[PDB]
């Protein structure tokens, strides 16, 4: 007699050669990395494998809306490498630029958080049902093809709708982090400066480089310049 | 004094799909669909058992060229298309 056991073992038809490497996922085309949530190589998979979908590419936004040249600004700043959101000033000393670390970090954390939500460990499937068939068997085979093809077309919708919603929310959250940053400094100098209508603040008082840095790091006391800025606005 | 505010921008970015826009440009994106393959089945971690010249049922019965597969455990038995049966002609209802 044969010894009967029940476990993770399975069978699969494949002509791909065997190599001395490591890979949780295995396909008839060859082992593929399961670091991505979905795959398009083959519907027959063994082990921890990504979900098979009809789409060949599904880009997930890990960055923000890109505007290089011609909402509030005419374009984004290509010279920023130290962060996503930053400041620029034309003061008495010269012209400088610096990034806001908190707003950049807060936008990265939201993307890093949902990025984990999309790549969470995929399904681990071992012995399933055969999806490729050598010859026509009739009613039973027609159902097996229908069961799987239904699962594929449903997953393809679940994936393609996911990237649309996640990226729509990605652009919304990153664009709102700048609206909140512009609103942050907008509250810093209430009536000490006015919104020029393009993303720039016209500070009507004498503000040096250290004064600009006081606005950047959040130590700007408007009462010091309120007696000066208000005079320059209406006179 | 003037204090302008803005965001960073890449010289060339990636296009993504959204609810409203099919082709909208962003600074960075990642691919979620695994489309490339090494072409080779990694023998680890799953205990891969190459079927080589016979099927699983041929080794279960005891075909002469499949005496090596006796008492062999496997996490995944891989049947080759180059398989054949050399012993007595049989059929499994």
């Amino acid at each position: 007699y044969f010894k009967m056991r029940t476990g993770k073992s399975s069978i699969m038809r494949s002509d791909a050669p065997i190599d001395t490497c490591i890979s949780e996922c295995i396909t008839p085309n060859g082992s593929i990395p399961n670091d991505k949530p979905f795959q398009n190589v083959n519907k027959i998979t063994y082990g921890a494998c990504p979900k098979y979908v009809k789409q060949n590419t599904l880009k997930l936004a890990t960055g923000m809306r890109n505007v290089p040249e011609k909402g509030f600004i005419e374009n984004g700043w290509e010279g920023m490498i130290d962060g996503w959101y930053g400041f620029r000033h034309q003061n008495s000393e010269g012209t400088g630029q610096a990034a806001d670390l908190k707003s950049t970090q807060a936008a990265i954390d939201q993307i890093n958080g949902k990025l984990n939500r999309v790549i969470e460990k995929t399904n681990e499937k071992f012995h399933q049902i055969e999806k490729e068939f050598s010859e026509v068997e009739g009613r039973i085979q027609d159902l097996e093809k229908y069961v799987e093809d239904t699962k594929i077309d449903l997953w393809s919708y679940n994936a393609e709708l996911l990237v649309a919603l996640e990226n729509q929310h990605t652009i919304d959250l990153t664009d709102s982090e700048m609206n909140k940053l512009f609103e942050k400094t907008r509250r810093q100098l209430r009536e000490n400066a006015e919104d020029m209508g393009n993303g720039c603040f016209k500070i009507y008082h004498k503000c040096d480089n250290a004064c600009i840095e006081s606005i950047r790091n959040g130590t700007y006391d408007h009462d010091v310049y309120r007696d000066e800025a208000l005079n320059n606005r209406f006179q | 004094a003037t204090l302008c505010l803005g965001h960073h921008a890449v010289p060339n970015g990636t296009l993504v799909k959204t609810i409203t826009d099919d082709q909208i440009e962003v600074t960075n994106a990642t691919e979620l669909v695994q489309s490339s393959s090494t072409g080779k089945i990694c023998n680890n971690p799953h205990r891969i058992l190459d079927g080589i010249d016979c099927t699983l049922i041929d080794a279960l019965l005891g075909d002469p060229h499949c005496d090596v597969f006796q008492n062999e455990t496997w996490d995944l038995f891989v049947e080759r298309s180059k398989a054949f049966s050399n012993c007595y002609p049989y059929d499994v209802p």
Partner: antibody
Amino acid sequence: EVQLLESGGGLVQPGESLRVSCAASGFTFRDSALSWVRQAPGKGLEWVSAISGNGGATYYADTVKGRFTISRDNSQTTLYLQMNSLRADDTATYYCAKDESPPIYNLMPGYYSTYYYMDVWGKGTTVTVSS
Amino acid sequence: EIVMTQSPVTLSVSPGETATLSCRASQSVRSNLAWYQQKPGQAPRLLIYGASTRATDIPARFSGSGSGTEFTLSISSLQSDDFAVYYCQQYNHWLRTFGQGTKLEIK
């Protein structure tokens, strides 16, 4: 070599302050994050705090949330940790460790990637809090 | 704010046998779970990170597996120098927590 060495530590009375240094040498360009991990004599490990490239942390364990403050000096490539209002249970071998994330995370290189594991551990400095 | 519980506190395993460790975790955690081998009188050493995936130039006998809540660590071919203590951390709640620790004996 990604060697890093912890200096300082010793005997303190309860209620005192202590700053422990961590000279980050080697492969770490120090746009990567760093953390502090203490283990009490005979007790299990415990993550204390973390710091990112530049000042994206913050991030302190609830045991030391109000007591400890982590600092970073990239110009001299040294990680600090000012341990104020030390209590008796703060006696531990404070390890300094580099933090690494999966490459899919960490969008901008300098900022904090919220999913870190410690790969490079330091030699550790022993801090005893007693009378 | 997310406790980890290793089981058992200490296990005795003969050299050569496989030693399976447990790291039960409240709440859900998948993307990160690092295993460490802290030998007495030394700093911890990274073995596995994010579960499953092992660290650089560590032996292939150290296997990691786990989905959520329940996580395991099995040492295939056990050596006499493996008398270290094993810990498990995770993500996130922005706050990484360590495990209690699992002492491993030989013979």
